[PDB]
Ligand binder design. Structure first.
Ligand SMILES: Nc1ncnc2c1ncn2[C@@H]1O[C@H](COP(=O)(O)OP(=O)(O)OC[C@H]2O[C@H](O)[C@H](O)[C@@H]2O)[C@@H](O)[C@H]1O
Ligand SMILES: Oc1ccc(/C=C\c2cc(O)cc(O)c2)cc1
Ligand SMILES: [Cl-]
Ligand SMILES: [Cl-]
Ligand SMILES: [Cl-]
Ligand SMILES: [Cl-]
Ligand SMILES: [Zn+2]
Length: 282
């Protein structure tokens, strides 16, 4: 807990020059167009532009702790808005270009963006989500569940049960939820494209899921400001702000980034919306 390996912290940031960055996002667009099953893996870097600091970045939680300083939050979790990145991911699922979303993030922003829960694995849990120990019924709350570590919240199951409700926030020693990891693992293995956004890929087995896509000829894209455990295994690495990358990419795909009507929970993905015809590639 206190001695817990926090991994490589505060590594230098890489910025692709604008010309190289434009070319790689066009190449990313080519890969999304060519791919039959695209899986997205997200981590703390997709939430930094909403004022929620990451863990291993220059001003990350663990980086700042290492130097006797504190992380700085520019929002509460409750007042945090989905980024352009979050909202681009909502649209990519709606138009059938996203098969599955795997996230290490406990910040609740995918759920709140209105991203469908049945196409999302929340590997490390969700601040806003409590679960009944007896019937496993989950509750998505409008405020953060006050505890961490799979502890009693003080609330009780209301299923037509009075089961003890507990947080979904893994402590260091806790293994990943078997449902989410199993779905994340199946998505990643079956994927022919795995795109990583704002994760250093340092956590096992979360960070290892995208590598599973490489088995059977799959392509791995890594979007991150810093180096990542698995840079070597990437078909493509894009060093830039995940919002610049995703807004440029949406523009190439001919997709708008949808409006956020405030916190909304969608349990089941809706029928797929129309999308632009694919460019001629080869
Ligand atoms: N706007 C941005 N655009 C692009 N990259 C960014 C941006 N902001 C930050 N980054 C990058 O975003 C990356 C985020 O790296 P890490 O901080 O390790 O977050 P994780 O989600 O992988 O952390 C995994 C778990 O570890 C913890 O213990 C918790 O349990 C976490 O759930 C960095 O490399 C930045 O360079
Ligand atoms: O696994 C975890 C469990 C709990 C927390 C707590 C707060 C926190 C801090 C951040 O800078 C980002 C984030 O999304 C959450 C963080 C990680
Ligand atoms: Cl903190
Ligand atoms: Cl829809
Ligand atoms: Cl904790
Ligand atoms: Cl198009
Ligand atoms: Zn119950």
């Amino acid at each position: 807990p206190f001695t817990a390996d926090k991994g490589k912290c505060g590594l230098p940031e890489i910025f692709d020059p604008p010309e190289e960055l434009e070319r790689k996002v066009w190449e990313l667009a080519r890969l999304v167009w060519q791919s039959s099953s695209v899986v997205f893996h997200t981590g703390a870097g997709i939430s930094t532009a909403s004022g929620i600091p990451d863990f291993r970045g220059p001003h990350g939680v663990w980086t700042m702790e290492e130097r006797g300083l504190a992380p700085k939050f520019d929002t509460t979790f409750e007042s945090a808005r989905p980024t352009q990145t979050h909202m681009a991911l909502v649209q990519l699922e709606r138009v059938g270009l996203l098969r599955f979303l795997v996230s290490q993030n406990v910040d609740g922003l995918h759920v709140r963006s209105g991203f469908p829960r049945d196409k999302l694995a929340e590997l490390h849990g969700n601040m806003f989500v409590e679960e009944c120990a007896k019937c496993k019924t989950q509750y998505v709350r409008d405020t953060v569940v006050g505890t961490m570590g799979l502890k009693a919240t003080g609330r009780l199951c209301t299923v037509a049960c009075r089961g003890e409700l507990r947080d979904t926030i893994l402590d260091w020693e806790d293994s990943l939820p078997d449902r989410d990891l199993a779905l994340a693992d199946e998505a990643s293995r079956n994927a022919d494209l795995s795109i990583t956004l704002g994760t250093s890929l340092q956590i096992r087995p979360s960070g290892n899921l995208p590598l599973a896509t490489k088995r059977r000829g799959g392509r791995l894209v890594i979007v991150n400001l810093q180096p990542t455990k698995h840079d070597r295994h990437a078909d493509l690495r894009i060093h830039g702000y995940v919002d610049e990358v995703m807004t440029r990419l949406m523009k190439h795909l001919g997709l708008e980034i949808p409006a956020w009507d405030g916190p909304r929970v969608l349990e089941r993905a809706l029928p797929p919306l129309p999308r632009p015809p694919t460019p001629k590639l080869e």
